Amino acid sequence: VWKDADTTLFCASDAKAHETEVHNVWATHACVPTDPNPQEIHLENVTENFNMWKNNMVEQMQEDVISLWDQSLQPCVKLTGGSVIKQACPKISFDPIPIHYCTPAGYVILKCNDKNFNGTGPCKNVSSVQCTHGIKPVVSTQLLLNGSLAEEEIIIRTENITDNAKTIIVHLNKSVEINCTRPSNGGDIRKAYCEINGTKWNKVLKQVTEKLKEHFNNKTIIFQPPSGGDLEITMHHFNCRGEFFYCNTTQLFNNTCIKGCNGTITLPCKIKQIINMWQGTGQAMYAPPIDGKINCVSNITGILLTRDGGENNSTEIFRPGGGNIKDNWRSELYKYKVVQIE
Amino acid sequence: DIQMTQSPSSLSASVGDTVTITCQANGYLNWYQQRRGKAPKLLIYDGSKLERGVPSRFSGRRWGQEYNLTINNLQPEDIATYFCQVYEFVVPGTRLDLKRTVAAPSVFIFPPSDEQLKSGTASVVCLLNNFYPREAKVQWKVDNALQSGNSQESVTEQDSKDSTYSLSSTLTLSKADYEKHKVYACEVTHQGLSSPVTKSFNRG
Amino acid sequence: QVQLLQSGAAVTKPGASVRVSCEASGYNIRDYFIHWWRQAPGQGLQWVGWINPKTGQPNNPRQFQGRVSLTRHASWDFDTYSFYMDLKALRSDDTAVYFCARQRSDYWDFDVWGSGTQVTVSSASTKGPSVFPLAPSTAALGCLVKDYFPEPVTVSWNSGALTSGVHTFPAVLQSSGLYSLSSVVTVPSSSLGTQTYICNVNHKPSNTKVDKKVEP
Numbered sequence: 111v112w113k114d115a116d117t118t119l120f121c122a123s124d125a126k127a128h129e130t131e132v133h134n135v136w137a138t139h140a141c142v143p144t145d146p147n148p149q150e151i152h153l154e155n156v157t158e159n160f161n162m163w164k165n166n167m168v169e170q171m172q173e174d175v176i177s178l179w180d181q182s183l184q185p186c187v188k189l190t191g192g193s194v195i196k197q198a199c200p201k202i203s204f205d206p207i208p209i210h211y212c213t214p215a216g217y218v219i220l221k222c223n224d225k226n227f228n229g230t231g232p233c234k235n236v237s238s239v240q241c242t243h244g245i246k247p248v249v250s251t252q253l254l255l256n257g258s259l260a261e262e263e264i265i266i267r268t269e270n271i272t273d274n275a276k277t278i279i280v281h282l283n284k285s286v287e288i289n290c291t292r293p294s295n296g297g298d299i300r301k302a303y304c305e306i307n308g309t310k311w312n313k314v315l316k317q318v319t320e321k322l323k324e325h326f327n328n329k330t331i332i333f334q335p336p337s338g339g340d341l342e343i344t345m346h347h348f349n350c351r352g353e354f355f356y357c358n359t360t361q362l363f364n365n366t367c368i369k370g371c372n373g374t375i376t377l378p379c380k381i382k383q384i385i386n387m388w389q390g391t392g393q394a395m396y397a398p399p400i401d402g403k404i405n406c407v408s409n410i411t412g413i414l415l416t417r418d419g420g421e422n423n424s425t426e427i428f429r430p431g432g433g434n435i436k437d438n439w440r441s442e443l444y445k446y447k448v449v450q451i452e
Numbered sequence: 453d454i455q456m457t458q459s460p461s462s463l464s465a466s467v468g469d470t471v472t473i474t475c476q477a478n479g480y481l482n483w484y485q486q487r488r489g490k491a492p493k494l495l496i497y498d499g500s501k502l503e504r505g506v507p508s509r510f511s512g513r514r515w516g517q518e519y520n521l522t523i524n525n526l527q528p529e530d531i532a533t534y535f536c537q538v539y540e541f542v543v544p545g546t547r548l549d550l551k552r553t554v555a556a557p558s559v560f561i562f563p564p565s566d567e568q569l570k571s572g573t574a575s576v577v578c579l580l581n582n583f584y585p586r587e588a589k590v591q592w593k594v595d596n597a598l599q600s601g602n603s604q605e606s607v608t609e610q611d612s613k614d615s616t617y618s619l620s621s622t623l624t625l626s627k628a629d630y631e632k633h634k635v636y637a638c639e640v641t642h643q644g645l646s647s648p649v650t651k652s653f654n655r656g
Numbered sequence: 657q658v659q660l661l662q663s664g665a666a667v668t669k670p671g672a673s674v675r676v677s678c679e680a681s682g683y684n685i686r687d688y689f690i691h692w693w694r695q696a697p698g699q700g701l702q703w704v705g706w707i708n709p710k711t712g713q714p715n716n717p718r719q720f721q722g723r724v725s726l727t728r729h730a731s732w733d734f735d736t737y738s739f740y741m742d743l744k745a746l747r748s749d750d751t752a753v754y755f756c757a758r759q760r761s762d763y764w765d766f767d768v769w770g771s772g773t774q775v776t777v778s779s780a781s782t783k784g785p786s787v788f789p790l791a792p793s794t795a796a797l798g799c800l801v802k803d804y805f806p807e808p809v810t811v812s813w814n815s816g817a818l819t820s821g822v823h824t825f826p827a828v829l830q831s832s833g834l835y836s837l838s839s840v841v842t843v844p845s846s847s848l849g850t851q852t853y854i855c856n857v858n859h860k861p862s863n864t865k866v867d868k869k870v871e872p
């Protein structure tokens with residue numbers, strides 16, 4: 111017998127002490143080494159309720175990354191209320207590493223094994239572990255990168271789908287590479303591009319529309335561009351090698367392709383020095399991009415969408431979304447829950 | 453796919469009374485009060501949870517698919533429109549009024565001003581004054597002919613004290629047509645009046 | 657103390673554009689969604705959309721899609737915010753009171769509302785009203801306020817000395833495009849002959865002030 115409880119976790123990783131990479135340095139001082147052989151025990155005939163949307167595990171990972179970024183990439187310029195801060199802002203090595211979250215003495219983590227679990231409700235196949243799986247603290251919008259895949263089939267997560275103010279998380283059951291480079295000799299040095307296999311993407315994209323039909327009474331499913339807002343959300347915002355990329359994904363949500371829709375899709379990108387910090391603390395300013403080829407190959411494993419409100423009846427409309435980076439952490443911790451041993 | 457309906461949409465009750473209205477929705481329902489010309493005021497959230505700084509007369513029942521809104525000890529300040537809301541969806545609402553001040557209208561008739569006739573326009577105004585209930589019937593007779601299509605009437609909100617209404621009907625026609633007939637009548641029909649009251653005047 | 661303050665009334669020709677503002681203050685503003693609503697004359701409310709203050713993200717229904725643009729900007733200390741609604745290509749039936757409100761919970765409960773902003777859409781240039789007298793015959797009398805645009809006018813009597821039994825009817829929309837109302841009052845029969853009765857009419861949009869004396 112136990113009970114749902116909150117407490118301070120701790121973290122584990124395989125940070126190398128010689129690495130100058132920023133995630134490596136942080137985890138070297140904040141995290142314990144990983145356990146070679148972790149135990150998992152499957153609990154017989156036990157049912158626990160989960161709620162990925164009210165899971166304090168998230169808050170803590172959030173504090174971790176905010177602290178990671180605040181120590182590691184500080185801008186040349188930032189605002190503080192009504193004052194301008196100037197500091198040295200040198201280039202850094204940037205490649206996020208998997209971080210496991212671990213309970214202290216007197217607590218455990220409960221894990222859901224139901225393959226079609228949406229994140230909110232009863233779970234029948236429950237086990238127990240000492241730590242989560244390794245989670246890369248990847249920050250991005252619109253698309254979810256380098257995460258974990260649903261064990262087939264595809265899953266829709268919300269909290270309340272009938273609420274249009276509630277972000278929808280689509281969890282893929284097969285991944286699609288995304289290949290982004292700012293070419294060698296830099297001639298706009300800020301001009302970059304992202305490449306996706308259209309044949310693979312459009313099949314997956316069609317399947318998502320099929321699953322959305324299940325939650326929306328066989329209505330027609332249409333994708334549309336973001337309606338407005340900060341550039342960090344209208345574009346596909348992410349960090350690669352320390353540089354701030356913004357990509358146009360109009361071509362990524364093409365309803366006609368769901369003729370010549372099989373070719374390699376190329377998305378136009380740009381590297382920006384002036385940004386709005388995801389921490390929510392206003393504008394910052396960074397140095398021009400480094401020299402040479404800058405390449406990021408990632409897996410798309412999930413999408414964040416927002417449904418148009420109001421009376422539509424005939425159709426439902428879905429535009430890409432984001433901004434709340436806690437939702438990135440929710441996409442990986444949806445299956446975990448802390449309890450205290452009574 | 454959220455659907456919701458309303459209840460009677462118009463009812464009347466006396467001072468210090470208990471009134472209820474019902475909606476039938478499938479989501480988080482809220483209740484608002486709106487006085488004429490002003491912004492809405494929240495009264496109840498989630499069906500039963502009473503908003504602070506709001507008289508304890510109000511309450512809500514959260515059983516099944518229907519949502520009740522109750523008002524005890526009806527005060528003069530409580531007279532306004534009320535409506536429910538689920539997410540982005542809202543119903544028109546339900547008007548409110550009191551009872552039992554059964555009074556006849558003080559029916560008057562007004563000819564056009566001489567200053568008006570210089571600009572080639574004649575507006576005849578018939579006035580009903582202080583009555584209850586609001587249901588009345590006004591028809592213009594010109595030389596004993598029913599006038600239809602060329603009339604605009606206007607109604608006031610229920611007066612705070614005497615609890616009565618007022619209606620003003622304006623017949624509007626060209627100067628040439630006004631100087632064409634002699635007798636203009638403004639017959640009035642009310643449930644209170646034993647007989648229809650007819651007021652008239654001869655042009656000149 | 658929380659506070660939502662909306663801008664002054666608007667008047668425009670069809671096909672044009674208008675911007676209404678909403679300024680929030682005394683609370684933690686990044687933590688709440690702001691919705692816009694509108695109310696056409698004699699009609700119920702109608703959802704215009706929401707905007708996330710943190711990101712600027714808008715959500716609008718099908719009809720206002722294409723038109724309408726929700727925006728926000730914050731002060732230096734993030735202590736005060738301004739929320740704009742830019743409605744494009746105005747149609748006559750866009751005439752409504754535009755509200756802004758705060759969404760407190762997931763209950764979509766709105767506890768704090770803006771005062772409202774009057775937005776009038778039509779042709780019809782600004783015109784003062786003509787005030788004609790309504791001769792009396794207890795008895796009754798009043799004034800006729802014909803042909804003005806836009807609303808509203810404010811009618812009193814004897815510079816606000818006579819308020820008893822005053823019935824100022826809500827204006828009506830004449831087929832021309834101009835509004836018109838009527839103000840009346842009731843007095844004893846012995847009143848006529850000694851007392852001076854004056855109706856005070858003000859139409860600010862045309863800067864037209866008129867004091868008329870009613871008499872048999």
Ligand SMILES: *[C@@H]1O[C@H](CO)[C@@H](O)[C@H](O)[C@H]1NC(C)=O
Nearest residue numbers: 152222223224234235236237
């Ligand atoms: C529960 O889930 C695990 C997956 O980790 C699976 O291997 C196991 O067979 C399931 N147990 C039962 C009996 O459903």
Ligand SMILES: *[C@@H]1O[C@H](CO)[C@@H](O)[C@H](O)[C@H]1NC(C)=O
Nearest residue numbers: 228229230231232266267268
């Ligand atoms: C997730 O599953 C639970 C249990 O069936 C259900 O209550 C909830 O509505 C589901 N969420 C959705 C529809 O995504």
Ligand SMILES: *[C@@H]1O[C@H](CO)[C@@H](O)[C@H](O)[C@H]1NC(C)=O
Nearest residue numbers: 255256257284285407408409
């Ligand atoms: C890309 O996804 C594949 C599985 O489809 C996986 O093997 C690989 O680890 C992923 N690459 C990453 C996360 O860098």
Ligand SMILES: *[C@@H]1O[C@H](CO)[C@@H](O)[C@H](O)[C@H]1NC(C)=O
Nearest residue numbers: 262263264265283284317321
């Ligand atoms: C992923 O799930 C869909 C149904 O949601 C299913 O059609 C498909 O077979 C699954 N993909 C794979 C690779 O198994």
Ligand SMILES: *[C@@H]1O[C@H](CO)[C@@H](O)[C@H](O)[C@H]1NC(C)=O
Nearest residue numbers: 287288289290291305405407
């Ligand atoms: C990614 O794209 C670049 C440039 O088009 C190409 O050189 C590289 O081979 C691609 N990498 C992979 C693994 O797809």
Ligand SMILES: *[C@@H]1O[C@H](CO)[C@@H](O)[C@H](O)[C@H]1NC(C)=O
Nearest residue numbers: 306307308309310311313372
């Ligand atoms: C692109 O995606 C399709 C769909 O799976 C795949 O079959 C094809 O081999 C890919 N094209 C490449 C890797 O050249």
Ligand SMILES: *[C@@H]1O[C@H](CO)[C@@H](O)[C@H](O)[C@H]1NC(C)=O
Nearest residue numbers: 335341344345358359360361
């Ligand atoms: C993305 O590209 C499309 C098509 O070129 C363009 O219409 C749109 O303005 C772009 N979106 C953003 C946010 O830059």
Ligand SMILES: *[C@@H]1O[C@H](CO)[C@@H](O)[C@H](O)[C@H]1NC(C)=O
Nearest residue numbers: 361364365366367369370371
């Ligand atoms: C979808 O893709 C097709 C194939 O390239 C393209 O021609 C078309 O313009 C796209 N549809 C849009 C963006 O309207």
Ligand SMILES: *[C@@H]1O[C@H](CO)[C@@H](O)[C@H](O)[C@H]1NC(C)=O
Nearest residue numbers: 248255256348349406407408
């Ligand atoms: C995903 O993983 C690959 C290495 O496996 C890395 O190169 C890439 O930077 C990661 N994605 C992002 C945007 O961090």
Ligand SMILES: *[C@@H]1O[C@H](CO)[C@@H](O)[C@H](O)[C@H]1NC(C)=O
Nearest residue numbers: 230269270271272478479480
């Ligand atoms: C979500 O909200 C609805 C409407 O208020 C409520 O009836 C329902 O129980 C909730 N469902 C979920 C998925 O939590």
Ligand SMILES: *[C@@H]1O[C@H](CO)[C@@H](O)[C@H](O)[C@H]1NC(C)=O
Nearest residue numbers: 472513515516518519520521
């Ligand atoms: C008010 O609501 C309750 C709950 O549904 C309902 O049973 C009852 O009939 C209503 N009360 C009145 C006075 O009709």
